Amino acid sequence: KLADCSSKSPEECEIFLVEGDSAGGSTKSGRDSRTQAILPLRGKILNVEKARLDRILNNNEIRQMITAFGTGIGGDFDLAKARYHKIVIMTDADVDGAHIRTLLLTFFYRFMRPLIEAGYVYIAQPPTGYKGLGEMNADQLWETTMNPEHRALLQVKLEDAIEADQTFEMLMGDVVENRRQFIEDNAVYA
Amino acid sequence: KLADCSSKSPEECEIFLVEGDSAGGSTKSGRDSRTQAILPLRGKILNVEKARLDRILNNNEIRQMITAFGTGIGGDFDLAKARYHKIVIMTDADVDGAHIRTLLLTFFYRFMRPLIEAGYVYIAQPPTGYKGLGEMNADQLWETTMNPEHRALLQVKLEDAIEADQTFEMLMGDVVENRRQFIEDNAVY
Amino acid sequence: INERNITSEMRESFLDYAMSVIVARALPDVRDGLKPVHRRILYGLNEQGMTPDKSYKKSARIVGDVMGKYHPHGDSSIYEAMVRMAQDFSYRYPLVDGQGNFGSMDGDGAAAMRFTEARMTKITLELLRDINKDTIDFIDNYDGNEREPSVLPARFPNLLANGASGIAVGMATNIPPHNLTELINGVLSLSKNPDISIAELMEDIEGPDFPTAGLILGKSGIRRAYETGRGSIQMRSRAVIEERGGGRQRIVVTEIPFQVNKARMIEKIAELVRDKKIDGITDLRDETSLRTGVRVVIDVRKDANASVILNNLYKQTPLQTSFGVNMIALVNGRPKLINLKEALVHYLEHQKTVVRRRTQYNLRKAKDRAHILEGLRIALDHIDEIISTIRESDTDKVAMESLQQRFKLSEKQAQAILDMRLRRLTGLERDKIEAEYNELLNYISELETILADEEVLLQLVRDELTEIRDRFGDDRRTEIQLG
Amino acid sequence: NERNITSEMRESFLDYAMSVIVARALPDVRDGLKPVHRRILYGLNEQGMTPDKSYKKSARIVGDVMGKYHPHGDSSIYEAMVRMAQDFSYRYPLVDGQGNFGSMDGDGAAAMRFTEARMTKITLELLRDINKDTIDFIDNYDGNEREPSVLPARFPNLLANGASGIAVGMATNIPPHNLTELINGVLSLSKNPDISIAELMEDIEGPDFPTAGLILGKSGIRRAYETGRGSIQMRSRAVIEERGGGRQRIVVTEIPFQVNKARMIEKIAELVRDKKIDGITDLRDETSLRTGVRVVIDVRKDANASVILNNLYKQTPLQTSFGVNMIALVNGRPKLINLKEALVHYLEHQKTVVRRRTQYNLRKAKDRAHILEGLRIALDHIDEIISTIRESDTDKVAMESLQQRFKLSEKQAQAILDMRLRRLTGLERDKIEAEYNELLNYISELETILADEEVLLQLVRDELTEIRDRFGDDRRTEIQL
DNA sequence: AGCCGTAGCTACGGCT
DNA sequence: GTACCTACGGCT
DNA sequence: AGCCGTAG
Ligand SMILES: [Mn+2]
Ligand SMILES: [Mn+2]
Ligand SMILES: [Mn+2]
């Protein structure tokens, strides 16, 4: 499913992880095929916090991300072997797109933590509204989200490792009650 | 994909070859699961007249029909080993349904010829109109096409073997011109 | 701006998703018993004019309309939700009247939406009754190009009647279906006594009533669920032991528990026999037909105790399945674990509001029509002067002002006179306008009587609920055995 | 009761074969559309999907077409609508699409759920005057709807956008053409019914592909226009240029029609890998939405790039032929047609459309003039009209009394009773008089057209010229001698 | 030989 | 969320 | 366990 870029120099290369195959093919046309790569994700990604190691390593979507990044995972992670210095999370400006983003950040934090530390993980900022990525033209997706001249990328930063470990365990872990307590405490119905 | 019947006596058992999985599931509910079996076909099946033996034997739809009938094929055909004494072709009352029927009759004539000769091959007569089998309720498919009390089955008969060989070669064969000539001669616009 | 902290990003994004699944996806509203997808389907059917008296329409056309106008999600999500509402084994009171293969109890799915057709059931008219009479608040759709209902009027208690099952984030819901005669009687008892206990309400509502019928073991699980909103209800298949000839016996199952897949249950019995985890079974057949109904036959080995085999089948297979009650519904836009009384209290309050708002709308409508008739009355009494006033006027605006000043008319009255066709000038029209006015003044007085007394309004709610109970109320299917 | 296998085969296969021929794979000579395409465009017209209105979800368009006119798979309808929106497939696109509608690499469009669509400005010309009794309407598949048997097609769409369909016993392969050239060809034919293929070719040079490229020679074009069958050699637009350090490269900017760019690149890559071609150091697809199509083939230093290019034409789809086989439905039956026959049948359809439109406009003008005549009597005797209505107990009595007293028809009396009081104002009174005077002049204008066949033919010519000036564009494909 | 174009897996919670 | 079996004719 | 039912 990976549509790689022409350049083999990882310093200038960027990989966009797009939500849906419809937005995948659209981003594949609008991109700068010299420095930009596209890896479409079907939809909802496996939650690594709830899944066991055998299931994680057997998942196709997870495997495709590991192969594309070319760093390895966990203890075998090699930052110098990174195939792209920009891993961009490109999901719809809706609640499900926010969920795929949480699922993707959970995988990167638990298996490719130094990739976030090096500032290689980014979040794409597509136009806000009712329209999803799959509904957009290839030129619209380029000018607003992929073009380095006009795009606004959010660099994912790790401040407190203890706080993040607790945050990933509460929100994505198997314990429902702690997650339910977080929802109840921070819920705004205005 | 086969939804077999309770009875293991082939003399009273019937197999319905239905067009589409939508009609397939519908016929499985409406049927008499004691004597009636259902084998749904995706859509357009392989034309054996145009295909090579290796491709015919490798086709999933063809293999599923051979396994269900349990007779074998060609020279290894055993009529006494038939699992059903009624093989019913149940396709939509439209032009594509007619095509699937031609494709199914081509396979039976070239690989299971004594099955037609024994009068085991039948054609179901669903209600004529704009509505396809996939659009019908399970109870109306039973009452109009599957119920032995009210259904009207057409028994497929072989009268002239020489004429049929020529007919299957002209209509389903690789030679387009003879098929085009047949269309031109019998076309009623 | 340029940067984002992973902890803040995770907390905000997950909360945004969690909240959306809770208030706008997996949980039903306490008032109409619907999730956003179901409400959008039923409203869609209402706007498309898909009433029971009209012909069926392609499911793909219904789904597509709902998708573009109100539900910006996958077609499979909308269609499969519409399919369930049409299944008499899923819905105790089906909301969709479907044409074609809409599935079976074996987990057999419906035909593709391009083959099936659908429309409203007669009971769905009661869910949408008075929707265009300012009874419920309308909200802007996802893109702001359409208007959609925040809640349906729901003239019957649909939450408890058809039940609910939804997996959200941090929580889930599992409300079983109930008998409509029992529910309305429960609402009527509550309307007469606000201090009614769960035990007293249970004299009307015996327990859940599944569309698949079957049996319920004891009242203790039903009791705990109605008191706390949580409880375990043991459901049993309707099974009998009968002779099959030659001194041999068989177990015949005619009803299975709610949401249990018949084919999957049969496979689990077959698996136990094969793995030799159960003794005494010689045969297992599914003799179910559209003519005879559900019939699962388990042949028992000669001289073996069939009652022992049946008891073991209840313990080892889904022949006995529990229903884990967890009554979570959206109360005032927020999730809440509710007991039987709270579910009925919130529903009765929604009905009082609907009937009040309907009476208020009908009064405004009547007062406006009376005002228009007053202007038409003046116009017919001075028609020669009305005609000349219009004729001497160059523009519509000039005609409007001249009519307003000369005949002491309002903008609405003058507009109605200019819109009047020449055929309204016929001889008996002045009597028709006078007759309509006199009846309208009586109607205004009738509606004002309702709004002046809370008890008259409450009795109207009671009377309308009784009418729905007499028309749609049916016999109890599920047997509650003691115990 | 019983059925002979020979009779069953002959009847069932003929029934299917005929249906694919007249109602599936072959286009009509008049509008250049197959049933699926006609049902999509008519569907868009009934749904009010004009270019001035906002885009609508493709799933809603497809679903509407499926239930109302096309009882077949959604993928068949959607993929046909997708093709009509692709500027690399259609020389004059018929569908204006929003979202991912596919690429030259064979990448499909986004799912029905995500994309949106509407008519293009040129499609308005295909549907122009459809509700003016120009074409015959037929009952749909279930008898619950009415559908067009053919679209008015105010531009020659069969030759303009071309056609490709695999039927039973036959197939069709008509290439796209230039609109300025086609209309000029129709205009030349309208002035000379005895015009030769050679004379028509002075206007229509040959096919004009949306993907541009090159055509080798005129012999293949000539054979196809004279007999309806011929082989046309299409070539990619390729140039040889320097890349620095005494090194060269082949730059492809245009590829042949219906050739998959990604598949063509893979075939070049395969040849290099299997060492079936010598002199290639690199192969990159530098194509972008900003720079356009750009395929770069880096040539080894001191190797002849012209030799490599010539070998690429022989071994890869860089050179592809177009097998012309012009089969279209003429009078509901398949026929192999030459260039003149295609233009002759089209011109006859236009003459019929314009005639039937003028006849319709005359009937509706005469009916409206009759209604305005009644309203004029009503205003001239309004005091008498009012009193006649007032003295009447019922609408039926008022109807009969008005007809009797003022020599009015049932329609005239009905229109007077339906008249609102606001129509009695000075501005609204003059409006009836102004409309009537305009209508009498319009009736006379239409009568002039129907009284002379040359005036009718000139109106067809003038309307075609207007479409040519508005939608006619430059030739893309270069025909090299 | 194979292509053109109309046709016929995951999240999430609760079970005990 | 996604897919790959098939008919059909003509060209390579 | 893996299933229920709205989501990608
Ligand atoms: Mn989305
Ligand atoms: Mn069909
Ligand atoms: Mn059990």
Residue numbers in the entry:
A (entry chain B): 417 to 545, 580 to 640
B (entry chain D): 417 to 545, 580 to 639
C (entry chain A): 9 to 491
D (entry chain C): 10 to 490
What are the paper's exact sentences on this?
Bacteria have two well-conserved topo2As, DNA gyrase and topoisomerase IV (topo IV), which allow for dual targeting by antibacterials, affording reduced spontaneous resistance. DNA gyrase consists of two subunits, GyrA and GyrB, and functions as an A2B2 tetramer, as does topo IV, which consists of ParC and ParE subunits. Topo2As regulate DNA topology by creating a four base-pair-staggered double-stranded break (DSB) in one DNA duplex, passing another DNA duplex through this break and then resealing the break.
In addition to the S. aureus cleavage complexes described, we also solved a 2.45-Å structure with a single etoposide bound. We further solved a 2.65-Å binary complex with this DNA (without compound).
